[PDB]
Design an enzyme around this catalytic site. Structure first.
Site, PDB file in Angstrom:
ATOM      1  N   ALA A   9       1.045  -0.985   0.332  1.00 13.12           N
ATOM      2  CA  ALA A   9      -0.019   0.061   0.205  1.00 13.12           C
ATOM      3  C   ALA A   9       0.848   1.469  -0.010  1.00 13.12           C
ATOM      4  N   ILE A  17       6.042   3.930   1.190  1.00 12.93           N
ATOM      5  CA  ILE A  17       5.581   2.804   3.016  1.00 12.93           C
ATOM      6  C   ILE A  17       6.471   3.356   4.193  1.00 12.93           C
ATOM      7  N   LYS A  55      12.877  -4.815   9.598  1.00 12.10           N
ATOM      8  CA  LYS A  55      12.180  -3.195  10.480  1.00 12.10           C
ATOM      9  C   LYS A  55      11.023  -3.844  10.312  1.00 12.10           C
ATOM     10  N   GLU A 278     -20.136  28.471 -11.145  1.00 10.40           N
ATOM     11  CA  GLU A 278     -21.324  28.022 -12.384  1.00 10.40           C
ATOM     12  C   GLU A 278     -22.622  28.568 -11.389  1.00 10.40           C
ATOM     13  N   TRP A 300     -18.352  32.098 -20.045  1.00 11.26           N
ATOM     14  CA  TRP A 300     -19.685  32.371 -20.374  1.00 11.26           C
ATOM     15  C   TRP A 300     -19.290  33.921 -21.104  1.00 11.26           C
ATOM     16  N   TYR A 326     -30.258  28.738 -17.711  1.00 13.33           N
ATOM     17  CA  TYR A 326     -30.470  27.249 -16.765  1.00 13.33           C
ATOM     18  C   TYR A 326     -30.632  28.648 -15.093  1.00 13.33           C
ATOM     19  N   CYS A 386     -28.277  22.904 -22.701  1.00 15.58           N
ATOM     20  CA  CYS A 386     -27.090  21.430 -22.837  1.00 15.58           C
ATOM     21  C   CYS A 386     -27.645  20.442 -21.691  1.00 15.58           C
ATOM     22  N   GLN A 406     -28.379  15.122 -20.808  1.00 17.45           N
ATOM     23  CA  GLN A 406     -27.591  16.081 -22.019  1.00 17.45           C
ATOM     24  C   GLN A 406     -27.575  16.125 -23.469  1.00 17.45           C
ATOM     25  N   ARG A 407     -28.194  17.288 -23.897  1.00 18.74           N
ATOM     26  CA  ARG A 407     -28.292  17.247 -25.557  1.00 18.74           C
ATOM     27  C   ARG A 407     -27.425  16.807 -26.252  1.00 18.74           C
ATOM     28  N   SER A 408     -25.758  17.431 -26.325  1.00 16.62           N
ATOM     29  CA  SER A 408     -25.166  17.713 -26.507  1.00 16.62           C
ATOM     30  C   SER A 408     -23.571  17.551 -25.461  1.00 16.62           C
ATOM     31  N   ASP A 410     -19.879  18.736 -24.820  1.00 10.61           N
ATOM     32  CA  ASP A 410     -18.468  19.014 -24.997  1.00 10.61           C
ATOM     33  C   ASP A 410     -17.200  18.059 -25.264  1.00 10.61           C
TER      34      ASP A 410
HETATM   35  N1  LIG Z   1       2.685  -0.226   3.238  1.00 10.22           N
HETATM   36  C1  LIG Z   1       3.333  -1.411   2.994  1.00 10.22           C
HETATM   37  O1  LIG Z   1       2.957  -1.815   2.464  1.00 10.22           O
HETATM   38  C2  LIG Z   1       4.322  -1.687   4.367  1.00 10.22           C
HETATM   39  C3  LIG Z   1       5.000  -0.348   4.748  1.00 10.22           C
HETATM   40  N2  LIG Z   1       6.345  -1.054   5.531  1.00 10.22           N
HETATM   41  C4  LIG Z   1       7.127   0.103   6.323  1.00 10.22           C
HETATM   42  O2  LIG Z   1       8.289  -0.335   5.707  1.00 10.22           O
HETATM   43  C5  LIG Z   1       9.279   0.276   6.581  1.00 10.22           C
HETATM   44  C6  LIG Z   1      10.241  -0.641   6.986  1.00 10.22           C
HETATM   45  O3  LIG Z   1      10.614  -1.215   5.654  1.00 10.22           O
HETATM   46  P1  LIG Z   1      12.437  -1.032   5.290  1.00 10.22           P
HETATM   47  O4  LIG Z   1      13.120   0.384   6.736  1.00 10.22           O
HETATM   48  O5  LIG Z   1      12.565  -1.125   4.509  1.00 10.22           O
HETATM   49  O6  LIG Z   1      12.811  -2.289   6.372  1.00 10.22           O
HETATM   50  P2  LIG Z   1      12.693  -3.983   5.842  1.00 10.22           P
HETATM   51  O7  LIG Z   1      11.048  -3.718   6.275  1.00 10.22           O
HETATM   52  O8  LIG Z   1      12.923  -3.949   4.115  1.00 10.22           O
HETATM   53  O9  LIG Z   1      14.151  -4.746   6.889  1.00 10.22           O
HETATM   54  C7  LIG Z   1      14.882  -5.073   6.527  1.00 10.22           C
HETATM   55  C8  LIG Z   1      15.918  -5.497   7.157  1.00 10.22           C
HETATM   56  O10 LIG Z   1      16.349  -7.009   6.865  1.00 10.22           O
HETATM   57  C9  LIG Z   1      17.509  -7.665   7.002  1.00 10.22           C
HETATM   58  N3  LIG Z   1      17.294  -7.419   4.733  1.00 10.22           N
HETATM   59  C10 LIG Z   1      17.382  -6.719   4.401  1.00 10.22           C
HETATM   60  N4  LIG Z   1      17.270  -7.094   3.311  1.00 10.22           N
HETATM   61  C11 LIG Z   1      18.453  -8.198   3.685  1.00 10.22           C
HETATM   62  C12 LIG Z   1      18.891  -9.074   2.657  1.00 10.22           C
HETATM   63  N5  LIG Z   1      19.711  -8.846   1.190  1.00 10.22           N
HETATM   64  N6  LIG Z   1      20.097 -10.018   3.320  1.00 10.22           N
HETATM   65  C13 LIG Z   1      20.182 -10.337   4.585  1.00 10.22           C
HETATM   66  N7  LIG Z   1      19.189  -9.379   5.739  1.00 10.22           N
HETATM   67  C14 LIG Z   1      18.326  -8.314   4.472  1.00 10.22           C
HETATM   68  C15 LIG Z   1      18.053  -7.103   7.860  1.00 10.22           C
HETATM   69  O11 LIG Z   1      17.678  -6.549   9.181  1.00 10.22           O
HETATM   70  P3  LIG Z   1      18.894  -7.222   9.574  1.00 10.22           P
HETATM   71  O12 LIG Z   1      19.586  -5.822  10.625  1.00 10.22           O
HETATM   72  O13 LIG Z   1      18.678  -8.459  10.386  1.00 10.22           O
HETATM   73  O14 LIG Z   1      19.762  -7.762   8.509  1.00 10.22           O
HETATM   74  C16 LIG Z   1      17.650  -5.549   7.360  1.00 10.22           C
HETATM   75  O15 LIG Z   1      17.661  -3.845   7.741  1.00 10.22           O
HETATM   76  C17 LIG Z   1       7.923   0.320   7.749  1.00 10.22           C
HETATM   77  O16 LIG Z   1       8.021   1.738   8.128  1.00 10.22           O
HETATM   78  C18 LIG Z   1       7.012  -0.336   7.749  1.00 10.22           C
HETATM   79  O17 LIG Z   1       6.462   0.444   8.651  1.00 10.22           O
HETATM   80  C19 LIG Z   1       6.517  -2.050   5.752  1.00 10.22           C
HETATM   81  C20 LIG Z   1       5.775  -3.637   5.404  1.00 10.22           C
HETATM   82  C21 LIG Z   1       4.780  -2.962   4.688  1.00 10.22           C
HETATM   83  C1  LIG Z   2       3.547  -6.070   6.989  1.00  6.85           C
HETATM   84  N1  LIG Z   2       2.326  -4.850   7.336  1.00  6.85           N
HETATM   85  C2  LIG Z   2       2.571  -4.022   6.549  1.00  6.85           C
HETATM   86  C3  LIG Z   2       1.512  -3.379   6.101  1.00  6.85           C
HETATM   87  C4  LIG Z   2       0.405  -2.616   6.434  1.00  6.85           C
HETATM   88  N2  LIG Z   2      -0.572  -2.384   5.543  1.00  6.85           N
HETATM   89  C5  LIG Z   2      -0.439  -2.627   4.356  1.00  6.85           C
HETATM   90  N3  LIG Z   2      -1.151  -2.514   3.707  1.00  6.85           N
HETATM   91  C6  LIG Z   2      -0.912  -3.569   2.527  1.00  6.85           C
HETATM   92  N4  LIG Z   2      -2.158  -3.491   0.865  1.00  6.85           N
HETATM   93  N5  LIG Z   2       0.068  -4.190   2.052  1.00  6.85           N
HETATM   94  C7  LIG Z   2       0.722  -4.773   2.505  1.00  6.85           C
HETATM   95  N6  LIG Z   2       2.159  -5.448   2.061  1.00  6.85           N
HETATM   96  C8  LIG Z   2       0.564  -3.871   3.906  1.00  6.85           C
HETATM   97  N7  LIG Z   2       1.986  -3.545   4.774  1.00  6.85           N
HETATM   98  C9  LIG Z   2       1.299  -5.661   7.999  1.00  6.85           C
HETATM   99  C10 LIG Z   2       1.095  -6.544   7.855  1.00  6.85           C
HETATM  100  C11 LIG Z   2      -0.281  -7.163   9.263  1.00  6.85           C
HETATM  101  C12 LIG Z   2      -0.551  -6.530   9.834  1.00  6.85           C
HETATM  102  C13 LIG Z   2      -2.502  -6.690  10.552  1.00  6.85           C
HETATM  103  O1  LIG Z   2      -2.507  -6.514  11.687  1.00  6.85           O
HETATM  104  N8  LIG Z   2      -2.775  -8.133   9.544  1.00  6.85           N
HETATM  105  C14 LIG Z   2      -4.157  -8.783  10.470  1.00  6.85           C
HETATM  106  C15 LIG Z   2      -5.607  -7.649  10.025  1.00  6.85           C
HETATM  107  C16 LIG Z   2      -6.374  -7.042  10.863  1.00  6.85           C
HETATM  108  C17 LIG Z   2      -7.500  -6.934  10.677  1.00  6.85           C
HETATM  109  O2  LIG Z   2      -8.172  -7.582  10.052  1.00  6.85           O
HETATM  110  O3  LIG Z   2      -8.329  -5.207  10.596  1.00  6.85           O
HETATM  111  C18 LIG Z   2      -4.156  -9.842  10.442  1.00  6.85           C
HETATM  112  O4  LIG Z   2      -4.786 -10.009  10.519  1.00  6.85           O
HETATM  113  O5  LIG Z   2      -3.983 -10.101   8.796  1.00  6.85           O
HETATM  114  C19 LIG Z   2       0.129  -4.649   9.812  1.00  6.85           C
HETATM  115  C20 LIG Z   2       0.725  -4.747   9.527  1.00  6.85           C
HETATM  116  N1  LIG Z   3     -18.711  24.593 -27.529  1.00 10.94           N
HETATM  117  C1  LIG Z   3     -18.999  25.490 -26.268  1.00 10.94           C
HETATM  118  N2  LIG Z   3     -20.528  26.194 -25.496  1.00 10.94           N
HETATM  119  C2  LIG Z   3     -20.318  26.550 -24.256  1.00 10.94           C
HETATM  120  N3  LIG Z   3     -20.796  27.375 -23.521  1.00 10.94           N
HETATM  121  C3  LIG Z   3     -20.888  27.281 -22.391  1.00 10.94           C
HETATM  122  C4  LIG Z   3     -20.441  26.500 -22.100  1.00 10.94           C
HETATM  123  C5  LIG Z   3     -19.578  26.228 -20.895  1.00 10.94           C
HETATM  124  C6  LIG Z   3     -18.023  26.321 -21.199  1.00 10.94           C
HETATM  125  C7  LIG Z   3     -17.212  27.748 -21.467  1.00 10.94           C
HETATM  126  C8  LIG Z   3     -15.850  27.183 -21.628  1.00 10.94           C
HETATM  127  C9  LIG Z   3     -15.838  26.069 -20.227  1.00 10.94           C
HETATM  128  C10 LIG Z   3     -14.097  26.102 -20.239  1.00 10.94           C
HETATM  129  O1  LIG Z   3     -12.825  27.382 -20.925  1.00 10.94           O
HETATM  130  N4  LIG Z   3     -13.383  25.303 -19.363  1.00 10.94           N
HETATM  131  C11 LIG Z   3     -11.989  24.856 -18.795  1.00 10.94           C
HETATM  132  C12 LIG Z   3     -11.083  23.958 -19.485  1.00 10.94           C
HETATM  133  C13 LIG Z   3     -10.271  23.385 -18.864  1.00 10.94           C
HETATM  134  C14 LIG Z   3      -9.893  24.273 -18.941  1.00 10.94           C
HETATM  135  C15 LIG Z   3      -9.843  25.347 -18.024  1.00 10.94           C
HETATM  136  C16 LIG Z   3     -11.489  25.701 -18.492  1.00 10.94           C
HETATM  137  C17 LIG Z   3     -11.338  27.498 -17.918  1.00 10.94           C
HETATM  138  C18 LIG Z   3     -10.900  28.242 -17.440  1.00 10.94           C
HETATM  139  C19 LIG Z   3     -10.346  28.475 -15.980  1.00 10.94           C
HETATM  140  O2  LIG Z   3     -10.124  27.901 -15.302  1.00 10.94           O
HETATM  141  O3  LIG Z   3     -11.651  29.752 -15.705  1.00 10.94           O
HETATM  142  C20 LIG Z   3     -16.308  24.874 -19.849  1.00 10.94           C
HETATM  143  C21 LIG Z   3     -16.727  25.152 -20.122  1.00 10.94           C
HETATM  144  C22 LIG Z   3     -19.707  25.718 -23.090  1.00 10.94           C
HETATM  145  C23 LIG Z   3     -18.993  24.365 -24.001  1.00 10.94           C
HETATM  146  O4  LIG Z   3     -18.419  24.074 -23.095  1.00 10.94           O
HETATM  147  N5  LIG Z   3     -18.601  24.695 -24.910  1.00 10.94           N
END
Ligand SMILES: NC(=O)C1=CN([C@@H]2O[C@H](COP(=O)(O)OP(=O)(O)OC[C@H]3O[C@@H](n4cnc5c(N)ncnc54)[C@H](OP(=O)(O)O)[C@@H]3O)[C@@H](O)[C@H]2O)C=CC1
Ligand SMILES: CN(Cc1cnc2nc(N)nc(N)c2n1)c1ccc(C(=O)N[C@@H](CCC(=O)O)C(=O)O)cc1
Ligand SMILES: Nc1nc2[nH]cc(Cc3ccc(C(=O)Nc4ccccc4CCC(=O)O)cc3)c2c(=O)[nH]1
Ligand SMILES: NC(=O)C1=CN([C@@H]2O[C@H](COP(=O)(O)OP(=O)(O)OC[C@H]3O[C@@H](n4cnc5c(N)ncnc54)[C@H](OP(=O)(O)O)[C@@H]3O)[C@@H](O)[C@H]2O)C=CC1
Ligand SMILES: CN(Cc1cnc2nc(N)nc(N)c2n1)c1ccc(C(=O)N[C@@H](CCC(=O)O)C(=O)O)cc1
Ligand SMILES: Nc1nc2[nH]cc(Cc3ccc(C(=O)Nc4ccccc4CCC(=O)O)cc3)c2c(=O)[nH]1
Ligand SMILES: O=c1[nH]c(=O)n([C@H]2C[C@H](O)[C@@H](COP(=O)(O)O)O2)cc1F
Ligand SMILES: O=c1[nH]c(=O)n([C@H]2C[C@H](O)[C@@H](COP(=O)(O)O)O2)cc1F
Lengths: 505, 505
Positions: A9, A17, A55, A278, A300, A326, A386, A406-408, A410
C-alpha cells in the site's frame, strides 16, 4: 512453480510506504484486505507464506498471523526452531526454496519493506503485484516502494474508496471463447452498417486508455475515458453552428459514484473553482454574465460577447446578458424575461424550491424532476440548455441519486464540468434535505469531440487514471443559496497537468 | 478429434427446411453466410468437408464448391474417381473417418437434408450447430429440421436482420481470467453497499433469460429481458402513490435497432394496435379519453375514471378529460387549457411542427428536442408525463435515431408500449421528413416492477426470444396526422402467448 505475489500500500505519487518504522495512515479496510488476500487458499491442509524484513517484523510486533507462516529475512535473528509459525532465513535468495519442495505452502506473498521489495523485483521472483494507492502526498516519508518495472501491466483498478477522508484504490499487476468471434466478424463482413455492431466498434489499442486493463475496468473514470475512445472509433465527421466540426455519436451514458468518492477527472487538472461559481450562479437564479467575470471566471464570455450576441440576432441585448438560461428556468419558469438587471423575485414557477420541498416531504415520489427546456422562451436564450432534464431519487438508506440528460456534450470542455457540476448540486441537495450522496448517471445525446481538441484529448488517453478526490462541506447552511467557495474542502486531489483547449464559440 | 458442425436455416416455429426439393425462401445473405462459415480454415493447405445427401446434392446442381470437398451420402451414386472435390460414401457412419486418419480435412460441416440431419444428431456426431431462424410460417413445408436435443445449449443469438421484408437470426449451439474474480469478491465482503459493484449485482441464473448465452447476447430484446433480471436482483421494495408496491432501481438504459427490425417484444403478444391508436392520438393534439374508448382501446380508463379524478382533486373535470398531458404539450405548449372539447388551434408552441420543419431544413442541428414537462400546468394533468424528453438525430446516412428519457417505467405493462410508441413515431418522422429509421435508445429513471407482475414477468423470462418482426407503411402520407391503422403492415410477428397483467391505477 507457485504464485509469488506482492502486497503493498503506497502513496499515489511518491509511492511511499511507512515513516519512522510505522505507516503514515490508519486505514482499517486496507488491513482487512491484507488479511483476505493472504488467506486465499484453494486446498484445506495448506497455508500461505508471508515474507518480510526484520524492520517490518519489528513494526508488526513480532507476533504470528492467523494460519500464515511468517518468513523473516534477517542476518542477525537466530532460527528459533520452537515456533513453527515463524521461520528466519539469512537472505532472500536462500529463502525462496518453499516452491521446489515444502508442498504445505500453497502460495507465496512478498510484503516486506523497501529492502525486500527492491530485491524481490530485481531478482525477478514476482509474478503479481497487489497495489493499494493512497491519496496522501503533503506528508513526509522515509521508506518508498520501487517503481514498477515495465514487465508488469495493470489488469485491474477498483473504484475509489474512502476512509477518514482519504481516497484509495486497489490495483493488480500481472507479468505479461473462440467460436463466437469467428461468427460475429463474418456477419460484420456480410452486413456493413446494416449490422448495428459495426456502428459501435470496440476501440483499438491506440485510443483505449490502459488497454492492459481489459476485464477490471471498475474505476468509474473509465466511464468517461472509454467514451472518448468510443467517439474516436465510431464518431462521424459532422458540421454544426460553429466553424469547428465535430466527431459525434448518438446515445451514450456515464455512471459515477458519489458515496466513497467525488467524480472529478484526474487525467486533467480540472478548474474546480470555476465549476462551483457557475453552479451557485445557477442556484441563485442569476443570468448576468458579468457577475462571473467579476469573480475571475471567463467561461460565459464567448457566448456573451457583443459580436456573438448580435450575430445570432440579439443586438438589442446588453454585453453579457445571456438571457433565460438555466438559473432563470430553475427559479422562474415561464417568466416574462426583460433584461438581466430586472427584478424577477416572485414571478415564474420556482422549480428548485419545490424540488427541495418534494424531496423532504415525499421521498418515495418518482417525479423529482428539474427541467430547463422552455420552448416558449428559446429564441431569447443566448444558447439553448445543454444539460436539460434532471431527475433525483431517494434510496431506502437515505441516499440521493441523480440522473441527467444532456442533448450535446463537449467532451474535453463541457463533460468534465457537467460531471462535477451536478455532483456538487446533488451533494448540496443532499445536505439541505438531510440525505447522503448516492450515484450519478449522465445520459448523453450528441456526444461529440471538436476537431481542435484531438491533439489534447489524445494526450488524456495516455495518462493512467488516479483515484478520485473527496469533497466535504465546511458548514451546514440554512437555505441553499448560502454556499460560498470558502465552504468547500477538496481533499486529496493530485491530478495530471492541465491541458488547454479552446472553446468553440 | 476435429470439429463437426451443422449449418442449417430452418423456420422459426415449425423448423422447416425446403419445400418440393427447393428452399421456401430466397435470402442472399444466408447463402453468403453459408459460404463464409464453410470457408473458415486456419491452415492454408487444408480444405473443409461438406456432407450432404443425394436429394440435397441434386438441389444444388451437382457442381462442386470453391475449395470445399463435398461428401455425398448416397446408396446409388457411383464413386467417380475423376472428380476430386466430390466423393460418395454409402452411409454416414462410414463417411466420418477424415478425423482420425485424414489430416487433409481440417473441419467438418454437416449441411444435408432431414435424412442427414436426423442421422447426424441421433448418432452423436455433432459438436456445434449454426442455426438460421427464418420468420416464415404461413406457407407449406415438406422437409423439417429435427428438434434440438437437450445436450445442446444456445451460446449466441445475433440481431434481427431483414431481407425482402423477412426477418432472420443467427444462433450457435454448443454441446455442453481467474485472478480478478478472487479480488473483486474480497472487496465485496469488506465494503457492503459502500462498493458500487454490490449495488448493481449481476443477476443469478434463475432470473437470467437463456443463461447459457453469456458472451453472445446480441439480440436487442435482451436489452429489455436483462433489465427485468437486473431489477429482480437489485430492486428495492418501495411504496408509491398506489397500493401496489414496486421493486425499483435508478438509472438504466436500453438500446434498439430500427433499420433491419422493429423493436416489438416476442416473449409476449404485445397489442400493437392499442399502441398506434395511442400514438396517433398524441400527434393530433387530442386529450379526450373517450376517443380511444370509442376505438376499443381501454388503457386510459383507470387514470380517467370519475372516481380517480375526484381522488386527485379534479372533481370539476369531465369523465375522461385527462387534461394537458403529452398530446397537448406536443402541439400546444403553454396553452390555456380549458376542457377536452375546445379549439386550441393557434395557441401554444407547436413543438412537433417545428420539429419536422427543423429535421428537414437543418439535420445537423443538435437541438431537436421534444419536451413534455411543463411545470406551469402540472396540477391540471390527470397524470404527469412519464416519458418526458425526446431528442432526435440525423446520421450521415439519412437515418433518424431517437433518444428518450422516461421518468418511470412500469416494466411489464408500460415499457413494451413505450418501446413501440417511440419506434413508430421515429418511423413516422423518418418518412414524412424523407429519412430512414435508425437506432432507438431509452433512458430510464425509476425502472420498477409492480409486485403483482412478479408471477407473470418470471414466466416471460422462461421463454427464449424470437427474431423481431418487420413494420412497413402501406402508403406515403401528406402531413403526419393522416396515418391510419389500415396503413400499417406487420410482417413476421410470431410471439409467445399473451400474459395478462393488471394496471396499478
Ligand atoms: N505500506 C506497506 O505495505 C508496508 C510498509 N512497511 C514500512 O516500511 C518500513 C520498513 O521497511 P524497511 O525500512 O525498508 O526495512 P525492511 O522491512 O525492508 O527490513 C530490512 C531488514 O531486513 C534485513 N534484510 C534486508 N535485506 C536483506 C538481505 N538482502 N540479506 C539479509 N538480510 C536483509 C535486514 O535486517 P537485519 O539487520 O537483521 O540484517 C534489514 O535491516 C516500516 O516503516 C514499515 O512500516 C513495511 C511493510 C509493508
Ligand atoms: C507487514 N505489515 C505492514 C503493512 C501494512 N499495510 C499494508 N497494506 C497493504 N495493502 N499491503 C501490505 N503489504 C501492507 N503491509 C502488516 C501486516 C499485517 C498487519 C495486520 O495487523 N494484519 C491483521 C489484520 C487485522 C484486521 O483484520 O484488521 C491480520 O489479521 O492479518 C499489519 C501490518
Ligand atoms: N461549444 C461550447 N459552448 C459553451 N458555452 C458554454 C460552455 C460551458 C463551458 C465553457 C468554457 C469552459 C472552459 O473554458 N473550460 C476549461 C477547460 C479546461 C481548462 C480551463 C477551462 C476554463 C479556464 C478556467 O479555469 O477559468 C467550460 C465550460 C460551453 C462549452 O463547453 N462549449
Ligand atoms: N434449409 C437448409 O438449410 C437446407 C434445406 N435442404 C432442403 O431439404 C430438402 C432435401 O433434403 P431431404 O428431403 O431430407 O433429402 P436429403 O438431402 O437428406 O438426401 C437424402 C438422400 O441421401 C441418401 N441417404 C439418406 N439417408 C441415408 C442413409 N441413412 N444411408 C444411405 N444413404 C442415405 C439417400 O440417397 P439414395 O437415393 O442414394 O438412397 C437419400 O435419398 C430440399 O428441399 C433441400 O432444399 C437441404 C439442405 C439444407
Ligand atoms: C445445400 N444447400 C442448401 C442450403 C441453403 N441455405 C442454407 N442456409 C444455411 N444457413 N445453412 C444451410 N445448410 C443451407 N443449405 C446449398 C449449399 C450451398 C449453396 C451455395 O450456392 N453456396 C455458395 C454461395 C454463393 C453466395 O455467396 O451467394 C458458396 O460459395 O458457398 C446453396 C445451397
Ligand atoms: N401505472 C400506470 N399508469 C398508466 N397510465 C397510462 C398507462 C399506459 C398504459 C396503460 C395500460 C396498458 C396495458 O394494459 N397494456 C397491456 C399490456 C399487456 C397486454 C395487454 C395490454 C392492454 C390490452 C390491450 O390494450 O389489448 C399499457 C399502457 C399506464 C401504465 O402503463 N402504468
Ligand atoms: O454545460 C455545458 N455543457 C456542454 O456540454 N456544452 C457544450 C456542448 C456543445 O459542444 C456546445 C453547445 O453547442 P450546441 O448549442 O449546438 O449544442 O456546448 C455547453 C455547456 F454550457
Ligand atoms: O407511458 C407510460 N409509461 C409508463 O411507464 N407509465 C407508468 C410508470 C408508473 O407505473 C406510472 C407513473 O405514475 P407515477 O410516476 O406518478 O408514480 O405510469 C405510464 C405511462 F403512461
Amino acid at each position: 512453480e507457485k504464485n509469488v505475489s506482492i502486497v503493498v500500500a503506497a502513496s499515489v505519487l511518491s509511492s511511499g510506504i511507512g515513516i519512522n518504522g510505522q505507516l503514515p495512515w490508519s486505514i482499517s479496510e486496507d488491513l482487512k484486505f491484507f488479511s483476505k488476500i493472504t488467506n486465499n487458499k484453494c486446498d484445506s491442509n495448506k497455508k500461505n507464506a508471508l515474507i518480510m524484513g526484520r524492520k517490518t517484523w519489528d513494526s508488526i510486533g513480532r507476533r504470528p498471523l492467523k494460519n500464515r507462516i511468517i518468513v523473516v529475512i534477517s542476518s542477525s535473528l537466530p532460527q528459533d526452531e520452537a515456533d513453527p509459525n515463524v521461520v528466519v532465513f539469512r537472505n532472500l535468495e536462500d529463502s525462496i526454496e518453499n516452491l521446489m519442495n515444502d508442498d504445505s505452502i500453497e502460495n507465496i506473498f512478498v510484503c516486506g519493506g523497501e529492502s525486500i521489495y527492491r530485491d524481490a523485483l530485481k531478482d525477478n521472483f514476482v509474478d503479481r503485484i497487489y497495489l493499494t494507492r493512497v491519496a496522501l502526498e503533503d506528508i513526509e516519508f522515509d521508506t518508498y516502494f520501487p517503481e514498477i518495472p515495465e514487465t508488469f501491466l495493470p489488469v485491474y483498478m477498483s473504484q475509489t474508496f474512502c476512509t477518514k477522508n482519504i481516497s484509495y484504490d486497489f490495483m493488480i499487476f500481472e507479468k505479461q471463447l473462440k467460436s463466437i468471434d469467428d461468427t460475429v466478424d463474418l456477419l460484420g463482413e456480410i452486413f456493413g452498417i446494416r449490422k448495428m455492431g459495426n456502428r459501435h466498434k470496440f476501440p483499438k489499442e491506440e485510443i483505449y486508455n490502459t488497454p492492459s486493463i481489459r476485464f477490471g475496468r471498475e474505476h468509474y473514470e473509465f466511464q468517461y475515458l472509454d467514451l472518448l475512445s468510443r467517439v474516436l472509433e465510431n464518431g462521424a465527421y459532422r458540421e454544426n453552428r460553429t466553424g469547428i466540426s465535430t466527431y459525434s455519436i448518438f446515445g451514450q451514458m456515464m455512471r459515477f459514484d458519489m458515496r466513497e468518492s467525488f467524480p472529478l477527472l484526474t487525467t486533467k487538472k480540472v478548474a474546480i473553482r470555476s465549476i462551483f461559481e457557475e453552479l451557485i450562479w445557477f442556484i441563485k437564479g442569476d443570468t448576468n454574465g458579468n457577475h462571473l467575470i467579476e469573480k475571475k471566471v471567463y467561461i460565459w464570455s464567448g457566448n456573451g460577447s457583443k459580436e456573438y450576441l448580435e450575430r445570432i440576432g440579439l443586438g438589442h441585448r446588453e454585453e453579457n446578458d445571456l438571457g433565460p438560461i438555466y438559473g432563470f428556468q430553475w427559479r422562474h419558469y415561464n417568466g416574462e424575461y426583460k433584461t438581466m438587471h430586472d427584478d424577477y423575485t416572485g414571478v415564474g414557477v420556482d422549480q428548485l424550491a419545490k424540488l427541495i420541498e418534494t424531496l423532504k416531504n415525499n421521498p418515495k415520489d418518482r417525479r423529482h424532476i428539474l427541467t430547463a427546456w422552455n420552448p416558449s422562451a428559446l429564441s431569447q436564450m443566448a444558447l439553448p440548455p445543454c444539460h436539460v432534464l434532471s431527475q433525483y431519487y431517494v434510496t431506502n438508506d437515505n441516499c440521493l441519486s441523480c440522473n441527467l440528460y444532456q442533448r450535446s456534450c463537449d467532451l474535453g470542455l463541457g463533460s468534465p464540468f457537467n460531471i462535477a457540476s451536478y455532483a456538487i448540486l446533488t451533494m448540496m441537495l443532499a445536505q439541505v434535505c438531510g440525505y447522503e450522496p448516492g450515484e450519478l448517471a449522465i445520459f448523453i445525446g450528441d456526444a461529440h469531440i471538436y476537431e481542435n481538441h484531438l491533439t489534447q484529448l489524445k494526450e488524456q488517453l495516455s495518462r493512467t487514471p488516479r483515484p478520485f478526490p473527496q469533497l466535504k462541506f465546511k458548514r451546514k447552511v440554512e437555505n441553499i443559496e448560502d454556499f460560498k467557495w470558502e465552504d468547500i474542502e477538496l481533499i486529496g486531489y493530485y491530478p495530471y497537468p492541465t491541458i488547454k483547449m479552446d472553446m468553440a464559440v
